[PDB]
Design a protein around this ligand. Sequence first.
Ligand SMILES: Nc1ncnc2c1ncn2[C@@H]1O[C@H](COP(=O)(O)OP(=O)([O-])OC[C@H]2O[C@@H]([n+]3cccc(C(=O)O)c3)[C@H](O)[C@@H]2O)[C@@H](O)[C@H]1OP(=O)(O)O
Length: 249
Amino acid sequence: EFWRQTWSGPGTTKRFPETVLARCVKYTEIHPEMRHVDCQSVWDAFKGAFISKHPCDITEEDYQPLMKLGTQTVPCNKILLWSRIKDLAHQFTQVQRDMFTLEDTLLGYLADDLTWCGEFDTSKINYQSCPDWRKDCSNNPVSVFWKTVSRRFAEAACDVVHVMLDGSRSKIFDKDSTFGSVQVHNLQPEKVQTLEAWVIHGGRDLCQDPTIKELESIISKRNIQFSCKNIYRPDKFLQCVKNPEDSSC
Ligand SMILES: Nc1ncnc2c1ncn2[C@@H]1O[C@H](COP(=O)(O)OP(=O)([O-])OC[C@H]2O[C@@H]([n+]3cccc(C(=O)O)c3)[C@H](O)[C@@H]2O)[C@@H](O)[C@H]1OP(=O)(O)O
């Protein structure tokens, strides 16, 4: 009973319902084009996807009603994907405002950095613990949400799709990541012309790393062109993105 926790992962973020709703209201303020959205209806559809459901039995179809309410057209040629480098990816698009990560969409913005799950056959949100993808089960409310939106976002991309990767990390490209397992394989060779990776540094040429060639090989088999660039000083990269007038760029 009370000393045991159902799951190995963090529980639902405190004030999750209030937070999702306040994020919806704020998003539709910052982004007028999405003001048709009823923030209450969005929350109801979000809640409906996982509440009373066993948190190891969530399906992509459970999120379909939410996907419909959060339908949004982003410019397909202005998409930035990323893996393991969320912070710089987000700061980039805070400055370069015509480019979008998933978290710059209504849906990604609502869910970013949050955890949520319900309990089997009750209407209570679980605030103690939620499944962990690796230790408990993969088909949980959080992982199934991200898989579904990450797929759709990738499918919508066109032209030169950019991906930010973490060069200071163990595996720069990881086939098992969300980017590697969901997004890479849902890039449409008809729409997408090129995938260009920006390998960021944290302290040589990293575009020759084995895993980068693995990625090169994978994208080539999909009949998309591959390109790669090092970013040797991410600090300077951001400064030059903020002020492209500056000469030392
Ligand atoms: N196979 C998997 N099954 C379940 N969960 C997984 C899996 N792989 C990664 N994740 C989780 O997604 C997050 C992204 O970090 P990565 O370093 O995993 O980066 P990534 O997974 O390549 O990045 C996500 C891409 O999709 C989007 N995404 C995905 C997930 C979360 C969020 C967010 O903003 O909150 C965003 C984002 O737009 C980006 O282009 C981590 O919390 C991962 O959990 P773990 O490895 O810590 O257990």
